Amino acid sequence: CGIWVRTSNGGHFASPNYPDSYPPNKECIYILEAAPRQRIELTFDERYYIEPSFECRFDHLEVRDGPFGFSPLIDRYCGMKSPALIRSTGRFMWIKFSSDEELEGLGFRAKYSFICQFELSGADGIVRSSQVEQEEKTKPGQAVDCIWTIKATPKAKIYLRFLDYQMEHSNECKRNFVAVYDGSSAIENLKAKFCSTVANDV
Amino acid sequence: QLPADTKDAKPLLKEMKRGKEFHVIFDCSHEMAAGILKQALAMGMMTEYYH
Amino acid sequence: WDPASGLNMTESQKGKPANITDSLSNRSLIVTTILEEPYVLFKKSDKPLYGNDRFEGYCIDLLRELSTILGFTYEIRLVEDGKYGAQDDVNGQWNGMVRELIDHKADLAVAPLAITYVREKVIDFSKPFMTLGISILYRKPNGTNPGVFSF
Amino acid sequence: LIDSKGYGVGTPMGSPYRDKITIAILQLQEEGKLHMMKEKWWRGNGCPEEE
Numbered sequence: 539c540g541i542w543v544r545t546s547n548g549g550h551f552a553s554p555n556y557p558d559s560y561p562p563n564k565e566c567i568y569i570l571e572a573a574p575r576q577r578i579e580l581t582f583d584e585r586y587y588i589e590p591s592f593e594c595r596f597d598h599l600e601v602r603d604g605p606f607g608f609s610p611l612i613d614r615y616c617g618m619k620s621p622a623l624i625r626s627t628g629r630f631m632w633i634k635f636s637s638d639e640e641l642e643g644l645g646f647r648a649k650y651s652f653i654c655q656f657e658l659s660g661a662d663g664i665v666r667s668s669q670v671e672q673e674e675k676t677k678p679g680q681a682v683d684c685i686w687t688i689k690a691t692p693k694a695k696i697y698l699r700f701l702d703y704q705m706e707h708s709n710e711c712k713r714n715f716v717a718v719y720d721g722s723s724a725i726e727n728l729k730a731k732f733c734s735t736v737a738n739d740v
Numbered sequence: 741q742l743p744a745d746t747k748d749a750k751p752l753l754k755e756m757k758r759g760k761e762f763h764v765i766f767d768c769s770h771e772m773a774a775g776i777l778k779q780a781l782a783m784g785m786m787t788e789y790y791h
Numbered sequence: 792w793d794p795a796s797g798l799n800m801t802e803s804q805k806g807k808p809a810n811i812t813d814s815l816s817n818r819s820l821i822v823t824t825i826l827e828e829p830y831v832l833f834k835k836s837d838k839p840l841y842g843n844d845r846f847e848g849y850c851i852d853l854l855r856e857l858s859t860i861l862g863f864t865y866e867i868r869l870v871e872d873g874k875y876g877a878q879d880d881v882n883g884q885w886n887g888m889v890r891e892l893i894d895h896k897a898d899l900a901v902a903p904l905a906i907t908y909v910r911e912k913v914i915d916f917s918k919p920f921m922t923l924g925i926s927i928l929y930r931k932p933n934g935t936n937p938g939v940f941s942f
Numbered sequence: 943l944i945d946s947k948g949y950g951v952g953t954p955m956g957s958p959y960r961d962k963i964t965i966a967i968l969q970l971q972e973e974g975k976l977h978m979m980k981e982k983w984w985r986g987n988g989c990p991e992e993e
């Protein structure tokens with residue numbers, strides 16, 4: 539499903555097999571990345587203009603601003619109506635399209651226009667703790683948070699082991715916590731979040 | 741209630757299969773009955789479980 | 792009610808918030824302790840703990856026995872800063888647990904607490920549950936005989 | 943010491959002397975004078991007959 543649309547002033551973004559009905563059982567990610575100081579304007583072209591009398595799940599196109607996952611929910615679109623054009627300066631509109639086990643529709647057509655995350659992949663390695671004074675030097679005073687992206691070798695599931703874990707600042711986590719996400723980086727599925735003395739391997 | 745227009749029970753029948761609703765009564769001019777049985781079969785509802 | 796908004800029922804916030812002076816209640820008790828090692832420590836887990844269960848200690852299940860046999864409520868409120876309650880002469884203050892043994896911000900404070908001369912002047916202490924004292928710490932000898940003359 | 947136990951000063955359930963005598967006992971403990979009286983009563987005849 540992946541159509542890497544990175545680094546375009548504008549470009550085509552659409553559901554798979556667009557002029558046909560989208561395939562079933564498809565949970566494929568899309569990501570829109572904007573260079574610093576830019577603005578993202580997402581143009582969305584509906585294929586079919588009717589007014590539904592209901593809103594339902596099982597086929598939903600939501601929009602997220604920021605680290606997919608952390609990104610606060612913007613809205614969750616479905617049906618056959620054209621969503622209104624979204625203008626934000628969050629610089630990261632990352633959008634996921636889902637699929638149920640049946641009941642495909644006319645799909646969708648869209649158009650993107652343009653006006654703390656460090657890559658860490660390979661076969662093995664270590665995420666340096668609080669390694670923030672080199673990547674994105676953030677002053678200690680404010681709350682800080684960062685995400686880390688792993689990519690194993692092709693055909694390789696991954697196992698993690700924590701070598702040192704101590705979040706002094708609480709037992710609870712309303713301020714500070716460490717969590718792991720499986721699949722791709724969304725709020726879809728917390729593999730686990732760690733708030734206590736010990737952090738188990740995963 | 742069947743949607744008044746579009747004769748499209750795909751939303752409706754999906755709702756039905758969600759609840760595992762293994763019994764149905766109908767009420768319709770038999771044209772709709774035929775036109776909806778084909779829908780049911782296409783949705784795969786046609787299994788010996790439903791009566 | 793309107794088609795748009797719905798029921799603006801004026802009871803959603805009651806005009807007269809119901810209040811009863813005397814009803815069923817428990818008299819909760821505040822204790823003050825410290826993170827001393829084989830006494831009171833955070834319980835070991837990975838999932839978050841909440842309330843009194845975040846802790847563990849020989850002292851804490853001792854208080855468990857106490858409340859079991861007499862009946863109380865657990866407000867394990869830790870001291871602000873690590874300190875045996877010990878007064879200061881200059882400040883005249885009693886920084887540490889003695890504050891809570893004085894200011895009635897808290898109650899009986901079960902923790903390593905030597906019932907000393909000055910403390911009973913300002914606080915009341917039950918009879919000690921276990922005695923103490925001073926001994927010497929040493930590394931036991933090893934089979935490295937001098938062997939100049941090991942004959 | 944298989945078990946630990948001490949002694950006390952018996953006072954009636956109402957006694958103005960309990961707290962003050964507790965204070966004095968603790969203070970004497972600080973000077974350890976009660977230790978010296980014990981030793982005169984124990985250690986004095988403790989080891990004048992070290993075999």
Ligand SMILES: *[C@@H]1O[C@H](CO)[C@@H](O)[C@H](O)[C@H]1NC(C)=O
Nearest residue numbers: 792793796797798799800801
């Ligand atoms: C509810 O009633 C109050 C008082 O008339 C009014 O100020 C408020 O706007 C009303 N709200 C709605 C939801 O109509």
